[PDB]
Assembly symmetry: D2
Homo-oligomer: 249 residues x 4
């Protein structure tokens, strides 16, 4: 199943889409400058591009840590991003009440990994009718993903992306099971599967090897965070994706 995001076709047998941008929104001008760069690079490489950021640092590690710009100022920055660039955007939500007004602005809304089993947030996300990105928790198997998709379907929204970020492997370590992408396609009705290579690594030659290996299994998209390093990175990812997508299934 493909999904249309404005102009963009996202699917497991389509050219890969890049989801990319900043950990946490800090200021308008800082964001425009990051986004500008991703757009120029993707535009000449001809890679469809969706801008990502959080407006809220929900898991900030110290009670004195930066909070983010908050919802109100974050949606303003997102509104500026879409008007200046004409691209879709994606952000995460952590509370049912945030869902409707986030979804008014942001093309894709994201269910945070920690919160995948929070049923009221699932329902409030489903209700908006928007494309939803479901971040697979490190503690859930690719087979348990259908249970979450079932909830979204029962609540009447089938426009779902599944997003891989690694699996718990002993203490304090992650491994990405390259067979899990296939399992998710097979049990979840060939919904778009994308690969969050950045969070898979947190526990760069390493990021390139991992991104290539995951994209070799034929995926809808790549999901990251951030002289000319991105561009050279994406040239290599595009070369692989083009080849893979050109072979019959």
């Amino acid at each position: 199943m493909d999904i249309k995001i404005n102009d963009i076709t996202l699917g497991n047998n389509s050219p890969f889409v890049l989801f990319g941008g900043i950990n946490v929104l800090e200021s308008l001008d800082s964001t425009l400058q990051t986004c500008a760069h991703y757009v120029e690079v993707t535009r000449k490489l001809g890679i469809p591009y969706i801008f990502k950021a959080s407006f809220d640092a929900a898991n900030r590690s110290s009670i004195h840590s930066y909070r983010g710009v908050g919802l109100e100022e974050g949606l303003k920055i997102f509104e500026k991003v879409k008007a200046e660039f004409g691209i879709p955007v994606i952000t995460d939500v952590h509370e049912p009440h945030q869902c409707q007004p986030v979804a008014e602005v942001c093309d894709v809304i994201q269910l945070p990994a920690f919160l995948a089993r929070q049923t009221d947030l699932v329902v409030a996300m489903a209700k908006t009718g928007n494309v939803v990105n479901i971040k697979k928790p490190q503690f859930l198997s690719p087979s348990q993903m259908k249970n979450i998709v079932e909830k979204f379907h029962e609540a009447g929204n089938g426009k779902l992306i599944l997003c891989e970020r690694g699996s718990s492997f002993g203490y304090d370590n992650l491994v990405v099971d390259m067979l899990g992408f296939g399992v998710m396609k097979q049990t979840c009705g060939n919904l778009p599967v994308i690969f969050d290579v950045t969070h898979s690594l947190q526990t760069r030659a390493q990021a390139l090897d991992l991104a290539l290996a995951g994209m070799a299994t034929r995926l809808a998209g790549l999901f990251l965070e951030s002289l000319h390093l991105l561009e050279d990175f994406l040239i290599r990812i595009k070369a692989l994706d083009d080849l893979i997508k050109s072979q019959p299934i």
Copy 2:
């Protein structure tokens, strides 16, 4: 470090405390009935007991499964449980705004595993001044519990219980690392550590083996998401009494 919960002393060198009750509150009548059974068994054996229930069923497996009575009517039920049995109670909270009103009635407030890194919730829980049960995520290592404890301490609350639930072990399976109890005591100032045996089991023989193994390491309490109860508790009490009666090694 011991924690006083009304007339109960909770600590890794005190007689173990049983936490248990019902999954989700629906009615007063139904709650009082379950709680009465726990009370009668634990009283007969002399085991301290804290009644546990959710007012919001936040991770129900179907979206349309009953969501619980909700905050307002839930707290009314908890009030009547406390009045009728004279025991402490515990419930989980989900948003910052819930913490104060819940803490007015519930002696222990519980931080759900999936919220354990939500800084706003941790702060609002800390500010109640109540005893807090921290449920350990199955993907978090025992040494990472320190970081959560730290956040609570920064926000002014040291009355913390750590609740073991098992660890991710390949796909689907959980294993309980019996060494992780000691790592938590050692790294987290010997806060009371309790063992949620049920979650780890996703059969009576299995629950018994696992509960006995954990209690053998010397723990403040046993946490169920559960004369069947009585027979099980007779065995746990036997082990706990033996272990606790002996001094920690020289």
Copy 3:
């Protein structure tokens, strides 16, 4: 199923048997000293005891590392240990040809964990008719032990002990699944199950005590352990727990 090893009765509902000694035999005199210590402590505590050592260093870390005294001198030392102390002994074998000569002298022969699926070694060990200790590989699940047991039975030997040594847990780490003991008992005919606490690991001997107590709480036939009187202090506590567990009806 219980096993007689000379005068010792090994079984999951019998008093636990301690297995211990040294890693690699170095000389007759230091062997006899180490054994005397274990014998002194276990006799005074009333615990049956089987001495263990390797005559071999098959996995020695450097090609220049110490080899051990080897089979011929190894077997001589085991003869002397047995004549001096009148206790059974246990050693590992890594090659099929080693099995019959080693079994001449050693009461129990041990299938190293790395080799537990090596069909020729299984067969050669089985043919000796001796008591065999099967080390569960860290990479095998408890439900797979039935397959190795089945092979030993096809090769004609049912005097089998199963030995837990932990399971792979990410890179460079082991966890012991306390539910595995019960799975082995249930699927392998209640053969004696023993717990290699020493290999399951890797303040600190705090750790070995915690692990040993947690494992013995599940009701096991025996324990593998290595040594002012730490061994004594550990065993007093393990024996108290074992006596309680074994006095409860299953």
Copy 4:
């Protein structure tokens, strides 16, 4: 570091080498037939090829299951393969005494994973001077491969291949850590790394093989286990990705 195996160059920056054949040697005519098919297909696509089989199946799922033709007859069969097709061959050794007899006939000798820490066997394999494939145990981390490599070096043999076969992942189940390849390259001096996709496990073998080879590897290790007739379709896709990845500079 590259290794020459007769006229084949094996290396992490060279066209991938296929190590393929069967599990256990069973009979002469069947072996030759299966080898013929591998040879035909790899020759057709220009893929360097090394025939693999065991003469001693040491971990059979039942004790009286056929162990294989044994050393003497197994080496005769390998001789016939090399004579008929003119390709290199690879087999596993199980005891020190086997190492010399096997190495005089076989181009690559393999250290089974379950024996990987047996020092006596490592020493005797090292002393042949033969190219050695080291099979990484599923319970061993990538950074611990350097300890095995060091024992081989100490005994005088540096012609070593590292073979990935997956890592234990909970019970009864394997995951391949795609970052494990780079760790082995970095810590073991960029010795050739190959990927045993068969023992790491359909559509799956292909996904897994393509992911592995995307990280830039010296070879692919499989048993036909694949259906033998779909071999060409499988290899066309591997070769396409390998040719892409190898054609770009590193970094």
